[PDB]
From Swiss-Prot, chain B:
Cross-link (Glycyl lysine isopeptide (Lys-Gly) (interchain with G-Cter in ubiquitin)): K22
Binding site for Ca(2+) 1: D21, D23, D25, T27, A32
SMART domains: EFh
Protein name: Calmodulin-1
Curated annotation (Swiss-Prot), chain C:
UniProt miscellaneous comment: Binding of [3H]ryanodine indicates that the heterozygous channel is activated by Ca(2+) concentrations 4-fold lower than normal. Single-cell analysis of cotransfected cells shows a significantly increased resting cytoplasmic Ca(2+) level and a significantly reduced luminal Ca(2+) level.
Segment of the intact protein contained: 2762 to 2906 of 5037
Free-text note on domains in this protein's UniProt record: The calcium release channel activity resides in the C-terminal region while the remaining part of the protein constitutes the 'foot' structure spanning the junctional gap between the sarcoplasmic reticulum (SR) and the T-tubule. Pore opening is mediated via the cytoplasmic calcium-binding domains that mediate a small rotation of the channel-forming transmembrane regions that then leads to channel opening.
Residues in Sequence repeats: 1-84
UniProt-recorded name of the protein: Ryanodine receptor 1
Family per similarity comment: Belongs to the ryanodine receptor (TC 1.A.3.1) family. RYR1 subfamily.
Oligomeric and partner information: Homotetramer. Can also form heterotetramers with RYR2. Identified in a complex composed of RYR1, PDE4D, PKA, FKBP1A and protein phosphatase 1 (PP1). Repeated very high-level exercise decreases interaction with PDE4D and protein phosphatase 1 (PP1). Interacts with CALM; CALM with bound calcium inhibits the RYR1 channel activity. Interacts with S100A1. Interacts with FKBP1A; this stabilizes the closed conformation of the channel. Interacts with CACNA1S; interaction with CACNA1S is important for activation of the RYR1 channel. Interacts with CACNB1.
Tissue note: Detected in skeletal muscle (at protein level). Fast- or slow-twitch skeletal muscle.
Superkingdom, natural source: Eukaryota
């Protein structure tokens, strides 16, 4: 739910864009959001 | 840090970036960074360009620091390869646990065999991949 | 198809009108073909024409069965429209009854050909969406599969 609130739309926008802001958002997502998902995967 | 960068490597980097430093103050712009990366022999990626921009105008000593970081990454890869190769004392991909413990005891780091006994057990013959994973934790 | 759309709109309280207003809940598009613009009717017919052209491209030809050597059958009584000119009434509502062909069964080979043509049409729609995305910057759609 926390990811879907804000983080998931950012990831979707980054995926759609595939810019400096886009690169920064992608780096943020890959360094903060998905590590938590991997930790909570079990 | 620049100890990872070799004397020949830092000399070559300085020779390549002397053109950038010839501008008057060494303030290398994005175009100068692109030309320096092209002259380095490897095309920089988008992440590398973003990191250089964030660390920046960029400077010739900053280029030296980036080259030193790249050399450190190369040295880390070489150390990983050395851990994968040398640890296979048997040479068949499965090093003996006793041989690995003896090698660890007789090491420059002067590590304790009893202390690292649990790590050695976790890893009869310890696989080379298992030894590399244990070394890299 | 327009009659079916009008019936669905009537089920949703939407009705045909000269002007379409969201507050009035009236859809000008869901109107009879004669009442609506002739260009709209031609565009609607262009869908079936394009489907027939795609079928012909796949070597499939559909021709109306001639009324020859066919035994007569009983026909259910239904209202018959007078053969005279009709003028649309804006005040009068739309009460369409589109035909239903659930009882009629298509051929199995024709069903497979229709499935292939539907896949081709989905591919064409995905190509149009890809062109729109390229106008917007490009993207990947799971539908285009």
């Amino acid at each position: 739910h926390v990811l879907d609130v804000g983080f998931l739309p950012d990831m979707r926008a980054a995926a759609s864009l595939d810019t400096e802001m886009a690169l920064a958002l992608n780096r943020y997502l890959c360094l903060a959001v998905l590590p938590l998902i991997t930790k909570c995967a079990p | 840090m620049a100890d990872q960068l070799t004397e020949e490597q830092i000399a070559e980097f300085k020779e390549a970036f002397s053109l950038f430093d010839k501008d008057g103050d060494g303030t290398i712009t994005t175009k100068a960074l692109g030309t320096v990366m092209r002259s380095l022999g490897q095309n920089p990626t988008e992440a590398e360009l973003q990191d250089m921009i964030n660390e920046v105008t960029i400077d010739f000593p900053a280029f030296l620091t980036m080259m030193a970081r790249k050399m450190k990454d190369t040295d880390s890869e070489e150390e990983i390869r050395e851990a994968f190769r040398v640890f296979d004392k048997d040479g068949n991909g499965y090093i003996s646990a006793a041989a690995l413990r003896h090698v660890m005891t007789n090491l420059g780091e002067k590590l304790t065999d009893e202390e690292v006994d649990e790590m050695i057990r976790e890893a009869g013959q310890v696989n080379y991949e298992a030894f590399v994973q244990m070394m890299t934790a | 198809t327009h009659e079916k759309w009008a019936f669905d709109k009537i089920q949703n309280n939407w009705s045909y009108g000269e002007n379409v207003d969201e507050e009035l809940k009236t859809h000008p598009m869901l109107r009879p073909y004669k009442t609506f613009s002739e260009k709209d009717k031609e565009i609607y017919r262009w869908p079936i024409k394009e489907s027939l052209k795609a079928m012909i491209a796949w070597e499939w030809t559909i021709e109306k069965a001639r009324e020859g050597e066919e035994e007569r059958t009983e026909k259910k009584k239904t209202r018959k429209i007078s053969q005279t000119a009709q003028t649309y009434d804006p005040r009068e509502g739309y009460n369409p009854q589109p035909p239903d062909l659930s009882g009629v069964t298509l051929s199995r080979e024709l069903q497979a050909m229709a499935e292939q043509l539907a896949e081709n049409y989905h591919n064409t729609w995905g190509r149009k969406k890809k062109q729109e995305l390229e106008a917007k910057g490009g993207g990947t759609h799971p539908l285009l599969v």
